[PDB]
Scaffold this active site. Structure first.
Site: not given
Ligand SMILES: [Fe+3]
Ligand SMILES: [Fe+3]
Lengths: 383, 167, 510, 383, 76
Positions: C98, C128, C131, C193, C227, C230
């Protein structure tokens, strides 16, 4: 079946857990040297997340990176900046912002802003704003200032990638987001006014044309282009961007010109927006000050070395910023004269404030000699 | 062989003593350049101090950088390599070299040697990074063309490795 | 006009593309073979204030559950020990991914020319950071409330001792930021990812709850909600370079190298953490891997990219072939070198062995036999003076480290598909373990000069290495790592020293 | 042992729970008539919490109260107000505020205010405020306005006790807290300035002396005293207080005088505080409007009856409010003349706005005839 | 003077007793046999903004536990 609530798994699990703790050190990352009295949660969650090896000052890891760029550039390396320090992890944002408090605070601002706008429109307070200030100065020139904020935001893209520690990276990214937030808030103000005043054009066409072709922003645009794309030393970008350019030109434009004058021309809307940009500036300043003054300019081993580069950069970017302010003061010719405010005496005092504050806040800290009266005259030549 | 501790050992200590003796920019530049040519990259002359060279390199860098700020006029810090060359000239010379490379093998040695000779503090950081980026772009284009075209057996021969064992 | 009005985020977003301007030097600072199109649009119309609003709301629910509810329920110490130990590794190893994804997303932001595309990457930069602090928070919470805080409380320094960490750094740190930005993007978003992190976050919550851990599901279920943006960023990276003739020439090579890179570490490491690091099992890794990699990613995700010239990776066939035994092969290395870790391990018990043999016919005859022999020789007993790494050396079962991926390989005991290649080049020996990585090293030797644990620790006795790396509890002598999850009979430095284990140079025999 | 996690109790509990639901109606208080499309959480949590019997319009309970006052006054009764309706529960605050969203929003404002002040002081922006405006008008007269807000807050004490339904009670209490919050924010501004400007006295002595003895606030003080302590009909208090007095005098003082002029005299601080009072005014207005216009003035059975009283009260309190504004405009004699702002033409337009908005927002809704130009002249006589 | 300063709730509370004023009709509307003294002080120095801040923080923890954690656990 969840092991916490299923009677049989919970029973099996209870049997496996020892009836005593296997260690008494419950402080997450207890070895971090605290800046303040006790380790803060901000330090615990942020510090040493960056996996630096011992060959990058302060790192706790070892060995080379597992994969480097073609040619050999390291994932992170000393070649990324001229400045040196005995420990890249030393920096601490005085506001102690890890992600959660950062979005929490901005969320408060996001929601309050919308309640304020719904009420402001119900109030009808736009009725007393000077229509010239609104239509010619605010719409066009305040609108064009969004590009300077946006260029400063963009300048952080390579910094985000290249900087050498976790606390620095956090400081830099939050600083960036606040810059793009400023650009979006300026555009939000313009779109809000368009809903209130028929015929007011909130499109960015004119503001963009002014930022790119109007002499008033020529020097500012040149400096922002240079800071963003002309260099890659990440410390130079942060210093030049926040501590020189934004601290002189930006503070003058936002505070001395658009905010101050809004309260001379009956504009009760804009000050709500600059209240945010100015709060973001001061929060960012506290962090930038810690990085450059406490950590770098005062490094026990490299302080003098770093001051040498900080002084060189300041001389160069301050000249650019003075030139930018020189062009910008040409804007006073388009506004109604108001003694103490838009007249020669007014502008001169606004300039003493900006340069005088800058001297105390930054220059004196790194040993950069500056003659405030000379800088005021240098800019007044454009008045 | 027997390695000493990771972070504090006699090899690192011995080198720090040599580095402390450096008194001028031109002496420290020769020192760092020889060091980088002898100990870094896959074409290094020696792997003897493989586990300590990166930390030692950092210490030479610190010495040179301090000697630069103490002895060089500020203007020189921004526009010249410590070899005395004009930084912009170094950039142009090395982009020209890589652009004349005819194979990935010639292109790679040019990019590697540029780094061994000019890595900061030899060349100012802004000029070094944009030159390193231009060189990398060319090296990747050459290398990534028909990447899987040559079989492993051929690549081993081209590289010149001595195959000691194949399972 | 006094109607109450405000300004919605999409209203502001509509003008974002117009914020960028043309100037000669307006180009990315990073080396790349590609050119991202300047008219690229983003899928999520998010502005800075709206991003903060969205995220802060999720945080309030998460932190309320953790600090109020679960703490009142004493949930922190209701976790099966095996899993609570595994979380020391999973949370901190994911933390680096992350963290480095912040720097990677910044690099991609720099790479894009369109304001919207830069904005999509920026949102990921912020996510990020979020996270990184969430992974840290799980370990911080465990440190306060779980029976064994060691390792949960200092992994940022203790992870440096062991070999498993080196591999994690290649896929989730160096792999994310070192190379052509597009190569990094493929490692991070297209493969990292879309293929691994997204299903992994979810899978971890399942295994966690099954094992009594309600902390992880609280945090990870929250991470999962970010997510999608991403994966959308990965998709946009492809769309943005699709009309660049360079992508026709290079994209599939960069994608194949990245896919190989990511799978090389995750195929063996995730199966190992899930199957050997838990008491209650959710499903066999071979089945999960096939669903995630072959079906979902390989089929659905990569399939949608076909219109832009993206092809299923050439090495997929090889990876699939290795996705049955590789994590079991890795487990031998991990159990054998347990003192170099920062978590307490548990040899599979009678029940686990039956489950392994039922799902991987032939496991008992190979791995089970070895684990049972180690147990007999005193694996768990401090007084035995027995470290399996020594047993491997004495029996000629050398462990090698792939110079490229840093993943350990035991050719004499492996059932997976790697194969050893040892080359000497310019006076230095290198061990490679597969065709894809050997090609990478042969073409790009200067990108791969990572020192391995044998090179660094050569000739040193194990307890000295552990002590130097702070691999001990607060008493200064009991090891953080242990070969069992019981509360008594913990090994100390003196017990390790007794074994006389000294690191060799495994390539000195060639 | 917690029944949720203890293996044996959880097992016993699991055995006792039926494997099917005993009813399918899961909507809390499903019988409440929704105002909007579906029942909102605001309605679910608030409506019918008040235990009214059928003899108080809309109540679902029955019988007399269990304990009454000495003499027989009911706990709640029809004798508490002149207005009548077919259902006292009909009111809905358009903002749907139950306690949680109310404190959430105010909490955002509380924390942002402190970040704004720390930055404002670091900025040094107080440097350009007109010192006369600061020292004589703001400190004294803005300071005195806190007593009007405080008297309006106090007026709600009996309303909080006497009103006839839960939604009304919530609306009234939130309105009250916002009024005292306004008084405290005015004092917070004065204390903040005292920290910045040596010699500035933030004590309430002078402001109190001005509120109680200065002719400028004599009419305002008389009206507030009457609304607060001179009456007990709870509907009269809310209507008079918010819909007449605060909507005319209060809006004029806060928006037309202190906020508007702050942006004529270079005051970049005050508008941050009035942004709050004005947002609170508009939120309160939406609720007051629902109670008096939608619910009462338009009651199908008692609308005409209620308009009769609403018109009578408006005539009386509007006269008081005009007299209060008449006294208040005497303040313009103490400020620097500024065309379009503090001159006769400026004040006149400020008055047309206030009365003109009031006519549309309230008067036209209840059928109260008002000649805006006459009210402007009535007040201008005090200029 | 540019030091960063704010205003703490107790600073404002210190002046609250002074907000009320004297006037003939300033008396309770309710029947009572007693008279509450006008110089009475309160124990908690709370102001409107601080009250909201205190309470909202408690609510966030409570509603997080209910809507997120307990609901995921099927505790209902
Ligand atoms: Fe993430
Ligand atoms: Fe992600």
């Amino acid at each position: 079946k969840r092991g916490l609530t299923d009677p049989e798994r919970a029973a099996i699990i209870a049997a496996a857990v020892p009836d005593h703790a296997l260690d008494t050190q419950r402080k997450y990352h207890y070895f971090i040297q605290p800046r303040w009295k006790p380790l803060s949660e901000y330090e615990q969650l942020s510090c040493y997340a960056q996996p630096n090896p011992d060959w990058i000052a302060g790192g706790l890891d070892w060995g080379d990176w597992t994969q480097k760029f073609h040619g050999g550039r390291p994932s992170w390396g000393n070649e990324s900046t001229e400045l040196r320090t005995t420990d890249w992890y030393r920096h601490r944002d005085p506001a102690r912002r890890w992600h959660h408090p950062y979005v929490k605070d901005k969320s408060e601002e996001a929601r309050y802003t919308q309640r304020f706008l719904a009420a402001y429109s119900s109030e009808g307070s736009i009725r007393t704003i000077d229509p010239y200030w609104r239509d010619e100065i605010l719409n066009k020139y305040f609108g064009a200032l969004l590009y300077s904020e946006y260029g400063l935001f963009n300048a952080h893209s390579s910094v985000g990638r290249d900087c050498l520690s976790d606390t620095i990276r956090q400081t830099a990214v939050f600083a960036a987001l606040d810059k793009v937030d400023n650009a979006q808030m300026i555009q939000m103000e313009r779109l809000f006014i368009a809903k209130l005043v028929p015929g007011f054009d909130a499109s960015t066409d004119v503001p963009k044309k002014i930022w790119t072709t109007d002499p008033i922003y020529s020097g500012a645009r040149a400096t922002v282009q240079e800071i963003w794309q002309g260099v890659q030393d990440w410390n130079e970008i942060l210093w030049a961007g926040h501590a020189v350019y934004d601290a002189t030109f930006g503070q003058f434009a936002r505070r001395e010109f658009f905010q101050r004058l809004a309260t001379v021309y009956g504009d009760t809307l804009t000050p709500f927006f600059t209240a945010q940009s100015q709060t973001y500036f001061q929060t960012t300043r506290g962090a930038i000050d810690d990085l450059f003054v406490y950590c770098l300019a005062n490094d026990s081993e490299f302080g003098a070395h770093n001051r040498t580069f900080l002084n060189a950069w300041t001389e160069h970017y301050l000249a650019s910023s003075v030139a930018a302010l020189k062009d910008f003061v040409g804007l006073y010719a388009k506004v109604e004269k108001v003694a103490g405010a838009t007249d020669s005496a007014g502008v001169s005092e606004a300039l003493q404030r900006v340069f005088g504050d800058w001297k105390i806040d930054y220059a004196d800290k790194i040993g950069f000699r500056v003659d405030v009266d000379q800088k005021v005259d240098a800019v007044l030549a454009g008045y | 062989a027997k390695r000493e501790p990771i972070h504090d050992n006699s090899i690192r200590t011995e080198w720090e003593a040599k580095i402390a003796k450096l008194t001028s920019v031109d002496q420290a530049t020769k020192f760092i350049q020889d060091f980088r040519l002898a100990y870094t990259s896959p074409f290094r002359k020696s792997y003897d101090i493989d586990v300590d060279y990166q930390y030692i390199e950092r210490k030479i860098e610190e010495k040179l950088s301090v000697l630069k700020t103490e002895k060089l006029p500020v203007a020189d810090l921004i526009t010249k390599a410590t070899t005395g060359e004009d930084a912009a000239a170094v950039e142009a010379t090395w982009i020209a070299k890589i652009k004349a490379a005819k194979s990935k093998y010639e292109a790679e040695a040019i990019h590697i040697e540029f780094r061994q000779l000019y890595k900061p503090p030899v060349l100012p950081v802004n000029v070094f990074l944009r030159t390193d980026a231009a060189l990398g772009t060319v090296l990747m284009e050459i290398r990534n063309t028909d990447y899987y075209g040559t079989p492993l057996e051929g690549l081993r021969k081209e590289r010149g490795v001595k195959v000691l064992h194949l399972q | 006009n006094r109607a109450p009005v405000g300004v919605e985020p999409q209203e502001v977003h509509k003008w974002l593309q117009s914020f960028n301007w043309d100037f000669k030097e307006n180009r990315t600072k990073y080396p790349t073979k590609y050119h991202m199109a300047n008219e690229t649009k983003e899928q999520f119309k998010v502005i800075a204030k709206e991003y903060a609003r969205m995220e802060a709301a999720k945080d309030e629910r998460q932190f309320g559950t953790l600090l109020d509810g679960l703490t009142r329920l004493g949930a922190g110490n209701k976790v099966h020990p095996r899993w609570g130990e595994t979380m020391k590794v999973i949370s901190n190893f994911l933390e680096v991914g992350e963290y480095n994804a912040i720097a990677a997303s910044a690099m991609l932001w720099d790479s894009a020319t369109a304001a919207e595309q830069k904005n999509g990457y920026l949102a990921q930069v912020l996510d990020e950071i979020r996270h990184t602090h969430q992974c840290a928070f799980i370990n911080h919470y465990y440190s306060k409330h779980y029976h064994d805080p060691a390792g949960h409380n200092d992994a940022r320094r203790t992870r440096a001792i062991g070999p498993l960490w080196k591999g994690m750094k290649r896929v989730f740190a160096d792999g994310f930021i070192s190379g052509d930005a597009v190569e990094c993007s493929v490692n991070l978003q297209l493969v990292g990812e879309a293929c691994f992190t997204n299903p992994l976050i979810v899978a971890v919550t399942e295994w966690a709850s099954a094992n009594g851990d309600e902390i992880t599901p609280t945090v990870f279920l929250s991470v999962e909600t970010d997510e999608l943006r991403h994966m959308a960023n990965g998709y946009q990276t492809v769309v943005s370079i699709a009309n660049d003739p360079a992508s026709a020439k290079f994209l599939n090579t960069d994608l194949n190298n990245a896919f190989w890179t990511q799978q090389k570490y995750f195929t063996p490491v995730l199966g190992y953490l899930f199957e050997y690091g838990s008491k209650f099992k959710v499903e066999p890794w071979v089945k999960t891997w096939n669903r995630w990699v072959s079906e979902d990613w390989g089929g659905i995700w990569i399939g949608r990219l076909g219109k832009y010239g993206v092809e299923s990776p050439r090495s997929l066939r090889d990876a699939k072939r290795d996705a049955y035994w590789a994590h079991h092969d890795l487990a031998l290395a991990a159990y054998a070198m347990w003192p170099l870790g920062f978590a307490r391990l548990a040899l599979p018990d009678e029940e686990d062995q039956a489950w392994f043999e039922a799902n991987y016919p032939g496991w008992a005859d190979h791995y089970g036999k070895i684990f049972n022999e180690w147990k007999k020789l005193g694996y768990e007993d401090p007084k035995s003076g027995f470290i399996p790494y020594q047993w491997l050396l004495a029996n000629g079962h050398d462990v090698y480290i792939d110079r490229v991926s840093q993943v350990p390989f035991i050719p004499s005991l492996a059932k997976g598909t790697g194969s050893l290649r040892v080359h000497e080049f310019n006076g230095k020996k290198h061990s490679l373990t597969d065709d894809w990585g050997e090609r990478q090293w042969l073409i790009e030797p200067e990108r791969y000069e990572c020192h391995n644990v044998f090179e660094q620790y050569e000739g040193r006795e194990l307890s000295e290495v552990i002590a130097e790396g702070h691999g001990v509890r607060s008493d200064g002598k009991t090891l953080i790592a242990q070969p069992h999850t019981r509360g008594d009979n913990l090994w100390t430095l003196e017990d390790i020293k007794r074994a006389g284990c000294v690191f060799p140079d495994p390539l000195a025999k060639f």
